[model samples]
Target: FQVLSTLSSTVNSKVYHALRRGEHVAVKEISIDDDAARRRFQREVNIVSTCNHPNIIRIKGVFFDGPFAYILLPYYHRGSLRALLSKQEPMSWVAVQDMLRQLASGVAYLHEHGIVHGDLKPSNVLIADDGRPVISDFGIAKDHGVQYMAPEQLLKSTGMSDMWALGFTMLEVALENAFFHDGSLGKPCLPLLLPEQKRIDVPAKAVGGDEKLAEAIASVLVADPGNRATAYDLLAHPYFS
Candidate 1:
């Protein structure tokens, strides 16, 4: 495999564009800090390889180069949704709505397979040249950012926390964080000093004035984990249809 260059980076791994036998692919490089880290790496690969959904990113293969393990994945031409949104690509409302549904579909599949997507975010979602969305980065949650965290998960992560994270990803595609974008998380905003009364209210114009989008997010962004909607349950919500 010939390394083209770095594509993206996370706290635990770095993805690089590579050319292998004239096949373009993304190689996620992970360090094997110890046996536990190695096991986690294997776990990530095992989970993704078994997933057979169109929206879930598949591992073409994986291997270890000395102390580092590399996961080979399909290189998405359109790149991540966050990258697109950051450039103000401005997809149509229909595209936005469909994008979210496909995302939820993949998350629902993962949940059915007993995976929680440790950290679900727009950055982890890639858009294909054909405009399909693919969910990536199925590794264990390590250095999670507070911005996408659900209130109950600030202390712990559950499938409910995954729903909360997915809800934030939905909110971003809608392009409005005005209700809670105050930047109070501060320096090294990992665990978040945490507000005793932090709350997220669905904005009126979220999802480009599509109230159903906000309503869909509202179904999962609940403070009470027990009452939050599951991925499968959310897919059947009216917003998707």
Candidate 2:
């Protein structure tokens, strides 16, 4: 694939929206400055290429040049959910339900396959042309944003933390606020290590007065990973129903 344009660049790579065989695709070119970088890039390709799911971004091919490596993937037109959250004005309950349910479905699929996303957040989710959410960017070490992560994730990676991230991301997108609280009188709190502190008490307004949805939110945000609901378990929640 030829580099059509640079879409975005992180410290380690530059993503391009490119054309290959008359098709539009996303090409991520990560800097392969050493054996370690090359191995890491190859590992990511191996992992993502094996993933076959509608909700996961599909990888097309992998390429290598002298100082850079490339992985071709399908280009989602709607971009990242993070960007959507910023531009979206007064997000609707239907929209919230649609996005969160789809996200949970995707996460559940990953866990069933014995794959933990390790890194799950709004920015890692892309909205497809059909408005369905697709989880992207896995098989790499993430070192930013402690608030979206669980305590165990900070120490080691596991699918359990993916559940924590899902609950936190859902609350953020649905409520348009990142603060954790009972939706009452107090300063907005961060998700703390304490089980009580991590519990999210979403207000009725956040879910458009749907008490069941509020209960669903609480079901996943439990501080103890063992007590937190699994992605498959969440699929059966009344919130999704």
Candidate 3:
């Protein structure tokens, strides 16, 4: 196996676009500490391995090398959702809705399986050649982006945190990554992108001219974790159709 190129890197791990045994795969090389940390890492890996879904990325395999462990994952030609947004033209509502459905379904699967995606963002979402959104970077949520954090998640992460982040994901999907909000005050206050823009009011898929879609996205952004719409809730939402 050899690296074709470095995909991404952090202090704790590095991702490689690799040629693995004549095929292609992404490899996340992670640093391991002592036994406790090792055991924790194992637990994390177990949870990740337990997940099985089209939108959730499955680990191809893991191998140890010195103090580091390499996790193999399926390679996507389109790379991450972040990459796609940056490279492509403005996404029409159909494409955005399709992406949302896939992610909401995937996240519901995760929550149903008792897994909390502590961190959720476009960068951690990979795009299939068909434009499917595959949630990646599992068991790797350290140093999360504050702009995506939910009010409840500043202290601890829950499925609701993932849902809240999904709201911002929707906003970015609409506005093409044009907003940011640090969790403070009673709720998220923002002129976030530009002075004129406060929230997402982008194109509507079928008929309603973005009202329903905006409502759908707002459904997940409620301050109360209990009030926040779940992924399953979003999967059933009419705007998703």
Provide the overall lDDT of each model, using Cα atoms, as 2-decimal numbers.
Answer: 0.73, 0.73, 0.72
lDDT of 1 by residue, 108-127 (tens): 89889888787888788888
Which portions of model 2 miss their true places by more than 4 Å? 8-12, 21-23, 30-39, 64-69, 140-145, 153-155, 177-198
Cα displacement (angstroms), candidate 2, residue 92, comes to 4.2
Which lDDT tens digits does candidate 3 get at residues 102-178?
A: 88889999999999887788888888777788887666422211558777554478898889888877766665422
Name the lDDT of candidate 3.
0.72
Worst 10 residues of 3 by lDDT: 179-188
In terms of TM-score, how similar is model 2 to the real structure? 0.79
Model 2 Cα lDDT, one tens digit per residue, 1-241: 6678887778887778788888888877778889898787777666666667888877676777878777777787678888886774555567778878888988988898788887788888888898888888786312111778786665576777888888878766656532222334333334445544766566765545578777777788877789889998888999897
CA shift of 103, model 3, Å: 0.5
Top-down lDDT ranking: 1, 2, 3
TM-score, ranked from best to worst: 2, 1, 3
